Write a protein that binds this ligand. Structure first.
Ligand SMILES: CC(C)CCC[C@@H](C)[C@H]1CC[C@H]2[C@@H]3CC=C4C[C@@H](OC(=O)CCC(=O)O)CC[C@]4(C)[C@H]3CC[C@]12C
Ligand SMILES: CC(C)CCC[C@@H](C)[C@H]1CC[C@H]2[C@@H]3CC=C4C[C@@H](OC(=O)CCC(=O)O)CC[C@]4(C)[C@H]3CC[C@]12C
Ligand SMILES: CC(C)CCC[C@@H](C)[C@H]1CC[C@H]2[C@@H]3CC=C4C[C@@H](OC(=O)CCC(=O)O)CC[C@]4(C)[C@H]3CC[C@]12C
Ligand SMILES: CC(C)CCC[C@@H](C)[C@H]1CC[C@H]2[C@@H]3CC=C4C[C@@H](OC(=O)CCC(=O)O)CC[C@]4(C)[C@H]3CC[C@]12C
Ligand SMILES: CC(C)CCC[C@@H](C)[C@H]1CC[C@H]2[C@@H]3CC=C4C[C@@H](OC(=O)CCC(=O)O)CC[C@]4(C)[C@H]3CC[C@]12C
Ligand SMILES: CC(C)CCC[C@@H](C)[C@H]1CC[C@H]2[C@@H]3CC=C4C[C@@H](OC(=O)CCC(=O)O)CC[C@]4(C)[C@H]3CC[C@]12C
Ligand SMILES: Cc1cc(NC(=O)[C@H](c2ccccc2)N2CCCc3ccccc32)no1
Lengths: 251, 94, 52
């Protein structure tokens, strides 16, 4: 019976499923601690999450030490050649920074909460990473990678067109705003949600002069709005339809 | 999609609304808001409401527009197009 | 005044054009140039689409 239980629990598939179940429980307790409170001292669930992170860091150090090269900088560079190890180490230092900030008093506790939320984001991306075992999800994952590269180039071209329209809009309308960083907020705010649905129907050609007087060229903003969203939405979004279709053939 | 949407909803409902006690309505919010965010309506009133000018701003209230932009961007475009390619390559065999 | 605001309007539409020139300069990159000729041919096809 001892040989039976020892032969079962050392199997790699058993190790994979046990690690996946523990990761699922980790993501559960992380959700619980980012929704439910924290005080001057952490709760038991948050102490468990801290224990999870620190033992993962210890295991990553064991991965670094027990590798194939024999020189320290060589094996550190070999371990850091993988991208997921790099982002894992970045997240471990992020969680330790957030835990140091959260163990201090206010206002550092809310900053630690913010770091905890962006680490949640990363650990859900790690759950996406683990989906390479499934034969139906792995192709979708490499789609996410190649489509992300093609959307990086798309985001460059979209960013040029959207930034030009936003600069033109915020320079025609609102013609009396002094130097402030909120101008960049407006020019990146308004067209970006304009693409994705909501066209801000109240904000386009409001009745003026019937009410404040009309700014000069206030009729030009509906025309450049029509031209911008038209070519933006249809030309680039369809373009990405064609791009992602011709990526899927090779993948 | 459920992984990505759930992560964004958890991040949003943990940054904004930072003082909700244990209740099952938290799951309602995190599955409520991004799911209708995908499909059209972006909830323009709820994104970056003016604070501090009005209740004071929660810490990191500016991070929610950034992660909103990043989430819906990769969500809508990456996965929806992905499904364009998927359903096209299904139609050939059928 | 009121010619100054008209000059401002012309300045904004010239901004529009100079961002399109920044789009023009992207023909050096091997990954952006194909997207640029997509913009051209898709613009012609959308001209006929815009008619219908
Ligand atoms: C071309 C792409 C890649 C980037 C486009 C960025 C612009 C939207 C930025 C870059 C330069 C920025 C300006 C740089 C300097 C200032 C002064 C700044 O003034 C202050 O912060 C007050 C104190 C001071 O005047 O130093 C207000 C924002 C503003 C007008 C910025 C507005 C936004 C601008 C135009
Ligand atoms: C080449 C491509 C892939 C670059 C993509 C990234 C940029 C589009 C991002 C990254 C950093 C961003 C900037 C980071 C910080 C700010 C300050 C922000 O200022 C305010 O909102 C005013 C102050 C406030 O109200 O908080 C305005 C947007 C801006 C310029 C952001 C505009 C968009 C930027 C340039
Ligand atoms: C591209 C094809 C398929 C459709 C054609 C679309 C455009 C040619 C239309 C759509 C919206 C229209 C605009 C909607 C509103 C106005 C504002 C109007 O000015 C006013 O009402 C007074 C000034 C103001 O209150 O803004 C001048 C016409 C204009 C620019 C229209 C011009 C023609 C536009 C750009
Ligand atoms: C990872 C995927 C597959 C599922 C994600 C589910 C989460 C959104 C759920 C699962 C665990 C849930 C928590 C489990 C326990 C509780 C206690 C619960 O408290 C009560 O109902 C009051 C009585 C009591 O405390 O027992 C309130 C909801 C809450 C915080 C839940 C909030 C929503 C959570 C984080
Ligand atoms: C692997 C994939 C395909 C699973 C897909 C199904 C889940 C995404 C669904 C099925 C059961 C659902 C849960 C069923 C019941 C509730 C309780 C609900 O609680 C409330 O709304 C609070 C009480 C109230 O106001 O009625 C919050 C959503 C939640 C957790 C649901 C979240 C979404 C769940 C997990
Ligand atoms: C991806 C390409 C094609 C376009 C670039 C999109 C983003 C880089 C833009 C779109 C929305 C922008 C955000 C819109 C609003 C805000 C809130 C702003 O903070 C405030 O106004 C003060 C705090 C608050 O009231 O929330 C800081 C900049 C930020 C995050 C902006 C940063 C830059 C963002 C994420
Ligand atoms: C905290 C925390 C993270 C974590 N999980 C992992 O980071 C990860 C994993 C994720 C999902 C399923 C199975 C494992 N994992 C744990 C041990 C080191 C390692 C090496 C290569 C690949 C994965 C992996 N558990 O607690």
């Amino acid at each position: 019976l001892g040989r039976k239980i020892y032969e079962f629990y050392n199997a790699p598939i058993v190790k994979f499923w046990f690690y996946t179940l523990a990761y699922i429980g980790y993501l559960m307790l992380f959700n619980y601690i980012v929704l439910v409170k924290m005080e001057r001292w952490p709760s038991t669930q948050e102490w468990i999450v801290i224990s999870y992170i620190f033992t993962l860091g210890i295991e990553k150090m064991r991965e670094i030490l027990m590798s194939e090269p024999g020189k320290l900088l060589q094996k550190v560079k070999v371990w850091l050649q993988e991208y997921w190890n790099v982002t894992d180490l970045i997240a471990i230092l992020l969680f330790s920074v957030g835990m140091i900030l959260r163990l201090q008093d206010q206002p550092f506790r809310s900053d630690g909460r913010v770091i905890y939320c962006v680490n949640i984001i990363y650990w859900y991306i790690r759950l996406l990473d683990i989906f390479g075992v499934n034969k139906y999800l792995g192709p979708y994952v490499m789609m996410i990678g190649k489509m992300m590269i093609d959307m990086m180039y798309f985001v460059i071209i979209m960013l040029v067109v959207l930034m030009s329209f936003g600069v033109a809009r915020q320079a025609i309308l609102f013609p009396n705003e002094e130097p402030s960083w909120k101008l960049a907020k407006n020019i990146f705010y308004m067209p970006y949600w304009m693409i994705y649905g909501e066209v801000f129907a109240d904000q386009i050609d409001p009745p003026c002069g019937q009410l404040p007087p009309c700014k000069t060229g206030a009729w030009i903003v509906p025309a450049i709005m029509a031209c911008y969203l038209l070519v933006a939405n249809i030309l680039l979004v369809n373009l990405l339809i064609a791009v992602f279709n011709n990526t899927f053939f090779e993948v």
